[PDB]
Nucleic acid binder design. Sequence first.
DNA 1: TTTTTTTTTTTTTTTTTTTTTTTTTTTTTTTTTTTTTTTTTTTTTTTTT
Length: 48
Amino acid sequence: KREQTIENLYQLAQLTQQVQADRIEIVLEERRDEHFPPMSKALMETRS
DNA sequence: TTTTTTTTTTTTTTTTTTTTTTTTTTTTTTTTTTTTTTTTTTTTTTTTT
C-alpha cells in the first residue's frame, strides 16, 4: 500500500527537477559576462 | 646657416580611498492603568434571664 507514498515522492521529484532546471536558468541569467575586477596599480604596490 | 627628433618642464582628467552628516532602527526607561490578597463591617441564630 506504498503506491501512494512512492508515486507521490516521485511526483515531488518530478516537479522538483524542474526547480533544478530553474536554478540552472537562474545561473544562465546570472552567468558573469564579466571577470574579476582589476587592480589599480597601487594595490599592485600594496599586495603584489 | 638651417632643419629634425627626443628628453625634459607643465597642464588636464579620472578612480580609489577615505570625511561628514542624516535617518532608521534598536535599547534602557517611569508614569499610568490594571490585577490579586485582604482586615473591617453587616446579618442571623441559639441560648439564657
